[PDB]
Write an enzyme that holds these catalytic residues in place. Sequence first.
Site, PDB file in Angstrom:
ATOM      1  CG  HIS A 153      51.844  63.474  58.418  1.00 48.03           C
ATOM      2  ND1 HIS A 153      50.591  63.991  58.109  1.00 48.03           N
ATOM      3  CD2 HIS A 153      51.356  61.988  58.909  1.00 48.03           C
ATOM      4  CE1 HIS A 153      49.552  63.105  58.263  1.00 48.03           C
ATOM      5  NE2 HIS A 153      50.190  61.868  58.869  1.00 48.03           N
ATOM      6  N   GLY A 169      38.949  56.510  59.069  1.00 51.51           N
ATOM      7  CA  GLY A 169      39.739  55.861  58.385  1.00 51.51           C
ATOM      8  C   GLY A 169      41.033  56.630  58.509  1.00 51.51           C
ATOM      9  CB  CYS A 180      46.860  60.036  57.683  1.00 54.98           C
ATOM     10  SG  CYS A 180      46.267  61.054  59.377  1.00 54.98           S
TER      11      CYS A 180
END
Lengths: 307, 296
Positions: free
Chosen positions: B41, B141, B143
């Site tokens: 993505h 955190g 991706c």
Amino acid sequence: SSGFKKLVSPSSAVEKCIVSVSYRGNNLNGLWLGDSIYCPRHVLGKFSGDQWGDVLNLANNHEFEVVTQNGVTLNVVSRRLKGAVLILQTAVANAETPKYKFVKANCGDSFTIACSYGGTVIGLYPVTMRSNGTIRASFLAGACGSVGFNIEKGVVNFFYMHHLELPNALHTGTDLMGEFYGGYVDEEVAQRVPPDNLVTNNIVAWLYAAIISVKESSFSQPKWLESTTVSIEDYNRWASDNGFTPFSTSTAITKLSAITGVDVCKLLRTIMVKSAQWGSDPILGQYNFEDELTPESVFNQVGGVRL
Amino acid sequence: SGFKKLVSPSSAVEKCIVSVSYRGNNLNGLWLGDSIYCPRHVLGKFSGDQWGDVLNLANNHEFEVVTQNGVTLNVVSRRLKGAVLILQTAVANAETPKYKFVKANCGDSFTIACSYGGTVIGLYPVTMRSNGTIRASFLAGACGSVGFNIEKGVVNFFYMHHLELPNALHTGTDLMGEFYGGYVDEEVAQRVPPDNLVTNNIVAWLYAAIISVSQPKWLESTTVSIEDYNRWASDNGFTPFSTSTAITKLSAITGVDVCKLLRTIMVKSAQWGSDPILGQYNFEDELTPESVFNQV
């Protein structure tokens, strides 16, 4: 379970500094910074009282076997004692010493333990400096020498060096100046294990965490959050008589009092109420106080909450 | 307790975490050999079948990869593998540790390299839940952040952050690109199955208790069948018990049978009482059997 974790510092800069120190059949971990190796003096043997200095004088530099994790043997060219800490001088410096600082830990202060065996860090885990100068860890034969640390503003902060196991899942050690936490000795004798009070400021942070995580999916405030306050000046009188540390002002505590809306005192009264008797409605699934989550740790994780 | 929830050391892993920026989008990557693994993505929001077509339109030079040392890596080829994008770097990561990609099973615990812009700022443990999610830190955190551990000198990579859910829940894929829990990388409504308590981990926690100590004030002296327990498990929010080498060994360190523990769970489950276990009045299901055995 919550989204508020007991975070551990990354170990890259510390692993490069851990080495094994061996002396006449004794083995443990040492901390290599610059041309100095810090390790517990009992690597010299089971001594006590004022024997150390005499033992050191008789000991010889070349008898100290120091090996890096890469398999490199370091030569020792001088030896000295600072408190209960033996500092061996190496012929050559550690080319990758990080920016560091020796700091003394207070009660409640949390940091990371680099659990080591034979000079290698095999695991990490958080711990808090208890009121009786001890910590609750998971060390095994050979863990001696393992350090406690954290990273702040690009500086490694060394707070602790493990020295021994005080019976029953408890451990003690020194700061890096060689001063034992509390006043226990690197010996196998008495364990005048003082009072281990539950840290108040960490309960406050933990309660602020439960409130925050609950608000994310509810409208109603927690069924355990008292409405009536109590005074900072007043809570302490109760604390000292029940096994709780004295509440202290904290910017972190402030930061999120202004964010949740609740006031520390409503939380303090909550401590009293639930301490005396805990209802049948858990806080974050627990029917017992969480003692090692700090204000700073809670504040740093709050940002990730869905607005 | 002096049993702790262990986190793996991170130096070897930190040398493999990188910054992957595209077209406006930004996240973390894992650099091993001459490959960079990151969520697809990063390409944008797309669906089903279009990822492939989208990739072909990209110019390798649009992928800005930077190491923690600030070095920029030149991308020379690309491909997709499940929901994971894989970029080839002109040069191999000469500091690639021995590693292996392993799929985490329900109950396995590992460490998340909490990362932002290719930098690990912290570490925390998580466990793989029955529904394919993990409860991370609210400061989980970005991706691309990976989940891993170290076993017998080898770095095991189990997970990679792909999507966030409310209440700090997250899910993602393994390093082969397969999603956990059948989720997909689409900001669309998706079913989030039940989060059951992990039996096997509870069991290890109990042994840690027995050992922390005679037979304890709540250890229950009666026994339950394994298929009998799993019977009561599937309808009380619990995981099906499956004995392993680690469990078998703790049962040997204590005379205590595994079925007496399965019993103690049933009892304390419907009605706990006022007898604390490790100063606790609730179950700890994130302390694995291997972790307990390793701490004795």
